[PDB]
Ligand binder design. Structure first.
Ligand SMILES: [Zn+2]
Length: 240
DNA sequence: GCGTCTCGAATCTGATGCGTAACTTGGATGCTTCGTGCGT
């Protein structure tokens, strides 16, 4: 899998819609997934409407949308892929905290896309870049493009465990917000400020925003136990 | 067209209570599509 639109024909196996124009000009990328639209490929002109708030994330100004993206842009597809992890095998739901911990500590090997909506409904799937290697996971949370490294997540979890192994009252070394919205997101808490060594503080201050967002779900007083998410592509196909 | 002496002294020079009370102690919002009508 190479493009976000590749999930349609590879895990949803949906044939293209009808009434679609056929490109008969010089190739140009899809305005959504940057996929080339060569001669003979089925496309459709852009008709996003006045409620499209993702003009900044458009891959190109070609005003053309491939059929895979047209399938992806359906309301049933948007709602189904709000908290979805699309691997080669199928589509899983990472909405639960345990699923997030499993994904960010024991990721699947194959290429996969990670989606997470920050609101009721958002355009995600055609914006998420593919994660080619599980060591450098690219996560699209709403409008933010996050890079999550599972090794850094594990190291931060170990740092917290060493910090709070003895004290009965568990305290978060770093202030984290699940929405990545608080003005104190990523700042060191007091307990971590005078209970962590210089190296651990330096490591905590030098984590990517995506790692802070992930730890905002995985790092708590009682760490969630990782579990495999349930397959969802059947539900999405049935509702489509 | 008069002046000296005299031209103070010794206390006392605060004391007592009161020297807070009740409420308030946040709220709401930051999605986009699909279908069905309704104005140019
Ligand atoms: Zn596309």
């Amino acid at each position: 899998m190479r493009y976000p639109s590749d999930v349609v024909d590879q895990v949803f196996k949906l044939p293209p819609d009808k009434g679609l124009l056929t490109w008969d000009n010089d190739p140009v990328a899809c305005s959504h997934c940057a996929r080339p639209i060569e001669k003979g490929d089925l496309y459709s002109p852009s008709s996003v409407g006045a409620f499209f708030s993702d003009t900044r994330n458009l891959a190109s100004t070609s005003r053309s949308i491939c059929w895979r993206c047209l399938i992806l842009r359906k309301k049933q597809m948007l709602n189904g892929l709000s908290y979805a992890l699309i691997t080669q095998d199928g589509v899983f739901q990472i909405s639960k905290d345990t699923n997030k911990a499993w994904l960010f500590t024991t990721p699947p090997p194959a290429p996969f896309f990670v989606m997470h909506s920050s609101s009721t409904m958002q355009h995600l799937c055609w914006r998420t870049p593919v994660t080619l290697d599980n060591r450098l996971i690219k996560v699209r949370y709403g409008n933010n493009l996050f890079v999550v490294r599972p090794e850094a997540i594990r190291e931060a979890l170990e740092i917290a465990d060493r910090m709070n192994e003895g004290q009965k009252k568990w305290q978060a070394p770093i202030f984290l917000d699940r929405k990545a919205a608080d003005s104190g997101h990523g700042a060191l808490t007091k307990a971590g400020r005078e209970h962590l060594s210089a190296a651990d503080q330096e490591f905590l201050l030098n984590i990517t925003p995506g790692e802070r967002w992930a730890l905002a779900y995985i790092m708590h007083s009682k760490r969630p136990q990782p579990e495999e998410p349930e397959c969802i592509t059947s539900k999405i196909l049935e509702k489509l």
